[PDB]
Design an enzyme around this catalytic site. Structure first.
Site, short mmCIF file in Angstrom:
data_model
loop_
_atom_site.label_atom_id
_atom_site.label_comp_id
_atom_site.label_asym_id
_atom_site.label_seq_id
_atom_site.Cartn_x
_atom_site.Cartn_y
_atom_site.Cartn_z
N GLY D 56 0.84 -1.21 0.00
CA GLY D 56 0.00 0.00 0.00
C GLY D 56 0.86 1.25 0.00
N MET D 86 5.41 -3.12 -0.05
CA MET D 86 5.81 -2.64 1.29
C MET D 86 5.73 -3.76 2.34
SD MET D 86 6.96 0.45 0.93
CE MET D 86 7.15 0.69 2.69
N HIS D 110 8.94 -4.85 -5.71
CA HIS D 110 8.89 -4.05 -6.96
C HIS D 110 9.13 -2.58 -6.64
CE1 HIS D 110 4.14 -3.57 -7.00
NE2 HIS D 110 4.70 -3.08 -5.89
#
Ligand SMILES: *C(=O)[C@@H](C(C)C)[C@@H](O)C(=O)N[C@H](C(=O)N[C@H](C(=O)O)[C@@H](C)CC)C(C)C
Ligand SMILES: *C(=O)[C@@H](C(C)C)[C@@H](O)C(=O)N[C@H](C(=O)N[C@H](C(=O)O)[C@@H](C)CC)C(C)C
Ligand SMILES: *C(=O)[C@@H](C(C)C)[C@@H](O)C(=O)N[C@H](C(=O)N[C@H](C(=O)O)[C@@H](C)CC)C(C)C
Ligand SMILES: *C(=O)[C@@H](C(C)C)[C@@H](O)C(=O)N[C@H](C(=O)N[C@H](C(=O)O)[C@@H](C)CC)C(C)C
Ligand SMILES: *C(=O)[C@@H](C(C)C)[C@@H](O)C(=O)N[C@H](C(=O)N[C@H](C(=O)O)[C@@H](C)CC)C(C)C
Ligand SMILES: *C(=O)[C@@H](C(C)C)[C@@H](O)C(=O)N[C@H](C(=O)N[C@H](C(=O)O)[C@@H](C)CC)C(C)C
Ligand SMILES: *C(=O)[C@@H](C(C)C)[C@@H](O)C(=O)N[C@H](C(=O)N[C@H](C(=O)O)[C@@H](C)CC)C(C)C
Ligand SMILES: *C(=O)[C@@H](C(C)C)[C@@H](O)C(=O)N[C@H](C(=O)N[C@H](C(=O)O)[C@@H](C)CC)C(C)C
Ligand SMILES: *C(=O)[C@@H](C(C)C)[C@@H](O)C(=O)N[C@H](C(=O)N[C@H](C(=O)O)[C@@H](C)CC)C(C)C
Lengths: 180, 179, 179, 178, 179, 179, 179, 179, 179
Positions: D56, D86, D110
């Site tokens: 998020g 995250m 990523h």
């Protein structure tokens, strides 16, 4: 839509018909009307049906299919862009030896899709009808390609994409054309 | 929801369960929890299941049905307002001789409904499964009513509405209670 | 949600956990928390996981699956209503010999589904990932059922629905329980 | 949510914290509050942070990250289901030697994503900021994995999915729990 | 649309065709119809294809591409505003030596995009198809630019924007025209 | 929201206040209430205000700002995640020497934003008011950073993003804290 | 649209073209088609381009701009109502000495706007592209106004509104016309 | 739209133009086109502009205003129904002595309305521009009515409704016409 | 719309105009155009205005009303279906002795309706204008009917429905068309 006669009307004078959209009842009516008109003008001269369609309504597709088989003129089929689902059946249904694809077009065959809601009895009636339609489309593909029914049935269970060279080997077209 | 314990919790102490809504997984989970709870409190004493439901999800209804048959206590069923579709099956699934309807309630049985979209292969697979689920519901109604499966099969093709006295004659309940 | 302690908490005292919804991250967290709690209360006593679920998120389902395998207590699984997709995997993942289904429940196994939009490079990366996830689900079903991987792979290509008796023959459950 | 204390409040007594949702400011405040609370109760005893998150908000995730590093207790991290984006950074940020994954979990790293609309000047300012954030995330991954920065940078250009054993080899976790 | 013949029909008399929209099946049919009409009017005279397009459907673009290559007349391509994605392919596909850009136009090439939902098996089939399409677009660009396939493949992984002068150096056009 | 006292109430006993949302009138009232409550408990003991906020309403922010200045206790400010817009003003407004940032937080200052619709007379009145508010925010930043007003004014014309170490150099915080 | 020929087609006979809408690809195609048509009718006679436009797409605008510079005929520009954004660039791009504004028209220049979502790598590529586009618009404004590039750059950072007399002093038009 | 030439095209032969809608860029372009056409047909003969309009876009209104002043022919203005806001400015802008209202028409003048969202700097720039536009509308009303600018400025702060005889006394029209 | 000339155009040759819709600015423009056109064809010959309208915009209606009084030809009015609100005013405004209703039509008169939002000052200004408009419609109705103003004012406070015979006795029409 440019003027000369609109551009499509002008091509219709050279016995060129464009099937360049999803196939619904409106598009089927327009394609059948053009084939019947061209047959009444000259029942002996070839008709050129250009196909760029992702497919659509099976019944609308079969209105065009039966008209293509019924009229006297040979219907030459030319795939540009794509002939998928019902588009692929109409491409394959052209006069033997006169089914063409441009070199970067793609052809795709697959089984029909449906939707049915209601009482179990009605769901089973409609499941029976989609089964009958599927067997019919397998039969049409077998007749035009020369492939055995059991190979067609296996190949259309999932989306089956083909280059023009693969479509030619399959028997969906007779020739890949690059240059006039 | 009034307090004494909320009113439903207070009736749960007298082993009363209210099935008073359409049947979805949420409602099934709550009815199953109350049945399992009452069994663990006393496996021998009757449970009173009041039914006012137009039905809903077949699988949610069969979770309740199998729990009612699985637990040790007899489940007394009482129809008030209506027991239709899956509601009628749960009413009929009460302990033999302990299935009741109030005199102005109505009972309705019918075949299941469904909806399937996708490839012909998937439509045919899901049509087979709705056929298997329909046969299962016919089997349950036949077992609890004493009617033959072929009579149940014919009777549920369309909505079959019954007064309490007709449902008693059909074998869906044992008694119409007035006072 | 009735009071006694709400009904679910009262059943949690008897080491009963209800999975009665589609599986998302929220549901997985709730199921995992109950499993971790019951282990900390008594690591040696069986946990009873009732399953009525159409499935849902694969990763949420595998959070529950791994917790069921990791904790010391045996997890008894009971199918009521349905155990489909990830629900069927969790049913099959119960302690060997302690996987149950009620007689009118249904079990269904099938391959995972996905959605991916964007560049061809990203579509191929995500195709590779769903391939890896599919192979992992085939391995998990092969382990718990004792079926060969190639039979599982063939069977899950389309929706594979089973009665409780077919699910027992397949090795997804050990016993069909009526009473 | 069941009552015993609700089930989460009961597990909090055993120093168990569940990060089981996408990370936004609300979730970050709840995790930080739980970490600060557990520190004040006992600054010495391990905290058990279970992670099932698709990720998020970067800034929400870094509030949790800095709180994990700042408090005295070791934060044990356990991946269940997934730790992506995250979530993966928070997994890798657990106390050295105490970062775990369950065997059918997955880990994905990523580069960050953004959205910016408006004047060219503002777009360029926000591109500079996403570049700074990207370099910071690479530095955090390098620090906790022991991977060189240029390998991290190359690998996070596209979605980089890992089994627990691949995540262990990469240095994102210490052990797959069997 | 002004009248003289509407303005576009009047320019069609001068063998001018305007591709000034996103490319879908409807636009492709209209462009192909104009190319086939102009060929039948005079198979030896150049056609002038003005391109201002962000691109669109790959299969619609390749209908135009294949028709451009198939007809006898040389197709002169002129970039105004932009030629991006399939627009850049059609620009690059003009008759050798007759590919033009106006000096403040921009040219962009990138790999294709897709969207696929459903079963793992169908996702993998559609990933194979977008891979095939990507390799075909690389082949077409390499052919018309004279760039090695591996350089094109590297360059289209992300949006590759060029000025007309960079596009000429790349081999996508032959001349930047000003007056 | 976990229980021990909810978690936030339990931290309030350690004189910890969390500002972890956009600032609207509702959030401002909650923060002011917590600041007034803590002052009445002990007017001499530090308050710990944790800030993770993208900012929000200027008047809601200034309600907090004036309360922080007005109460007797020193308000310690700690940036976690971000202090942007009004969040950065509140961070800068902490007791001198007691303004902290965690090392991966970010601080951002910018001029206020607005919307006004209606008659030209009303637009000009509201333009004048927004001018007055902007000048007030520049004065507050100058006061707490020790920066000259013309430097503050230049810097906030566009989004001015800072690492914790840049924010320390700027005078928005006193210390970056790691452990 | 009144008939005489529709009113626009009748004015097109006197070599009058109306740009009276926001600029998109559709509008650019119509303006380019009229410019090319009028050039082919007579390459030596002036074209009269009336501009009432808030602007729109930069690439659509630059299709018209390059066409205006490429054709043989001088394009006289007349601002009525407003020439904002890409409208102002096209007004300034008229033949030297033949750029006009009516006396209650308004002219506005500003930097381009954009929108980009996705991976950081893609945001940076598109930020680089909008930087290149902004620098190109500054170059075009400098060329037609004779203003230094740094003065244009400073003035277009925010909406820069001009009366016709201010636009004449700036070098965006040659004459304010009243009668 | 009846046929004889549609009805509007037929009246255009008698040099009659109907402005009977809100004023946007589309309407402005159609009115300007008709005025330019009638001037080219005969630059000496009067044009009859019937006005029934609540007004609309200021810049669209000023495109018509400046065209009315710039062309050689006198523009007779006739108010039917209403001439409000920009409609009233166009009514007042007719040739001196040739501005008419029908006896049950109404005329209303008011200051312009606006809307601006964004940074304080942008709001202030747009407040300045609306001020400049308002001053320009005051100047136009003062010029055609013979009223001093300060009287116009005070009168337009709120909606100022007038009967035709009040409008004549004000100097917005020259004659009220009945038969 | 059938062809012979479309059907409305063909009836326009017999000087027949149909007002068969709610009255807005668009309908008024069309009705005014037809009346001005017929007057220019022959200023001496009667025009036949058929009215089937529930009414609509007061200012649009008064544009038609004033045009009906201003032109040289007598306007014969024929009510078919209904003439309500503004439609009734236009019916009553026909040439004296040439106002007709078909025998199953209905006529309705009522006071105007309005909507106003904003500051108290603006509400009071618009309340004053609505009062002025109402007094004007009362004065028009008194003129054409011969009724005293205080009777009209009383009657239009609520929806006042009339048969054609009641409308004749009221003075709104001269003759009911019957055999
Ligand atoms: C290819 O053309 C197929 C789809 C468009 C992809 C097409 O063949 C198809 O399956 N069409 C579906 C269809 O017509 N189904 C009919 C129906 O209308 O119910 C079923 C009776 C056919 C078994 C469309 C998508 C409904
Ligand atoms: C009575 O309760 C029936 C209806 C609610 C009136 C009920 O038995 C029923 O048919 N419910 C339906 C249902 O559960 N259908 C499922 C399904 O579509 O998933 C079929 C598998 C059942 C054969 C509707 C969908 C709620
Ligand atoms: C059974 O539970 C399936 C449900 C019918 C959806 C389930 O196993 C499934 O496929 N779920 C899908 C899922 O979780 N997909 C994930 C994902 O997209 O996150 C893929 C990575 C799984 C390989 C849902 C329906 C998306
Ligand atoms: C993993 O957690 C990524 C997810 C895909 C969201 C996450 O790291 C991410 O990039 N999140 C994005 C984000 O927070 N972007 C911020 C922002 O615009 O505020 C950028 C400044 C970070 C460079 C959003 C939440 C998708
Ligand atoms: C440029 O024209 C690209 C997009 C417009 C940005 C174009 O090359 C592209 O990728 N188009 C995409 C497309 O046609 N994709 C199809 C599909 O998903 O159906 C591929 C499968 C083509 C084989 C769409 C239009 C974004
Ligand atoms: C930082 O907190 C800014 C945010 C980006 C919102 C904030 O300072 C801001 O400008 N907020 C805006 C605001 O409160 N504006 C008020 C208002 O319109 O009420 C102005 C009057 C203050 C100059 C919000 C976003 C409207
Ligand atoms: C004036 O015409 C500007 C706005 C319309 C007011 C115009 O110059 C502008 O910035 N247009 C934007 C635009 O075309 N942006 C492109 C794009 O997004 O494709 C950027 C690449 C421009 C460099 C519109 C508003 C998006
Ligand atoms: C009368 O015609 C006025 C309104 C329509 C009632 C008109 O004069 C008016 O103010 N129009 C407004 C307008 O054009 N405003 C522009 C704008 O916002 O761009 C201002 C810049 C003019 C000062 C809007 C359209 C109502
Ligand atoms: C009959 O025609 C009336 C209504 C349609 C029922 C009509 O007379 C009426 O009141 N129309 C209203 C109207 O035009 N009101 C205007 C306005 O707001 O512009 C007032 C100024 C008139 C007092 C509308 C159509 C409701």
């Amino acid at each position: 839509v440019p003027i000369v006669y609109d551009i499509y009307s002008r091509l219709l004078q050279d016995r060129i018909v464009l099937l360049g959209s999803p196939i619904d009842d409106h598009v089927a009516n327009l394609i059948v009307a053009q084939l019947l008109f061209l047959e009444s003008q000259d029942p002996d001269k070839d008709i050129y049906l250009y196909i760029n369609s992702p497919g659509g309504s099976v019944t609308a597709g079969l209105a065009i299919y039966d008209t293509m088989q019924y009229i006297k003129p040979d219907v030459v089929t030319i795939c540009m862009g794509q002939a998928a689902s019902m588009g692929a059946i109409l491409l394959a249904a052209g006069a033997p030896g006169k089914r063409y694809a441009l070199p970067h077009s793609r052809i795709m065959i697959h089984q029909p899709l449906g939707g049915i809601q209601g009482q179990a009895t009605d769901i089973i009636i409609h499941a029976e009808e989609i089964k009958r339609i599927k067997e019919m489309l397998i039969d049409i593909l077998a007749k035009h390609t020369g492939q055995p029914k059991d190979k067609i049935a296996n190949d259309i269970e999932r989306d089956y994409f083909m280059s023009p060279y693969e479509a030619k080997d399959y028997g969906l077209i007779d020739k890949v054309i690059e240059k006039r």
